Curated annotation (Swiss-Prot), chains A, B:
It comes from Rattus norvegicus. The postsynaptic actions of L-glutamate are mediated by a variety of receptors that are named according to their selective agonists. This receptor binds AMPA (quisqualate) > L-glutamate > kainate. Detected in forebrain. Detected in dendrites of neuronal cells. Expressed in the pyramidal cell layers of CA1 and CA3 and in the granule cell layer of the dentate gyrus. The chain holds residues 122 to 170 of 883 of the full protein. Induction: Down-regulated in the pyramidal cell layer of CA1 in the hippocampus by global ischemia. Ionotropic glutamate receptor that functions as a ligand-gated cation channel, gated by L-glutamate and glutamatergic agonists such as alpha-amino-3-hydroxy-5-methyl-4-isoxazolepropionic acid (AMPA), quisqualic acid, and kainic acid. L-glutamate acts as an excitatory neurotransmitter at many synapses in the central nervous system and plays an important role in fast excitatory synaptic transmission. Belongs to the glutamate-gated ion channel (TC 1.A.10.1) family. GRIA2 subfamily. This is Glutamate receptor 2. The M4 transmembrane segment mediates tetramerization and is required for cell surface expression. It is found in: Cell membrane; Postsynaptic cell membrane; Postsynaptic density membrane. Homotetramer or heterotetramer of pore-forming glutamate receptor subunits. Tetramers may be formed by the dimerization of dimers. May interact with MPP4. Forms a ternary complex with GRIP1 and CSPG4. Interacts with ATAD1 in an ATP-dependent manner. ATAD1-catalyzed ATP hydrolysis disrupts binding to ATAD1 and to GRIP1 and leads to AMPAR complex disassembly. Interacts with GRIP2. Interacts with GRIP1. Interacts with NSF via its C-terminus. Interacts with CACNG2, PICK1 and GRIP2. Interacts with GRIA1 and SYNDIG1. Part of a complex containing GRIA2, NSF and NAPA and/or NAPB. Palmitoylated. Depalmitoylated upon L-glutamate stimulation. Ubiquitinated by RNF167, leading to its degradation.
């Protein structure tokens, strides 16, 4: 989306890399729906691969 | 949300009951964010339970 400038960096890749680093195969992901499920969608998509 | 009259019935229950009827334990759920994440949250919470 154009004309919108977001100061906040994206956390998705960082979290994926952290989970990868800690060598976690199996875990529980708690999530709050008010902030949005986007990152959850990310970790779910990654979960299959 | 008030003042909105929604003709389309809620499909969640039929889905969950159908899954439980076919005796499904493990499966694949493909989804798009076009319609909203509500059904997804339904199958995820019910999967957790």
């Amino acid at each position: 989306h154009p004309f919108v400038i977001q100061m906040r960096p994206d956390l998705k890749g960082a979290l994926l890399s952290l989970i990868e680093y800690y060598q976690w195969d199996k875990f529980a992901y708690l999530y709050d729906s008010d902030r949005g499920l986007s990152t959850l969608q990310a970790v779910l998509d990654s979960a299959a691969e």
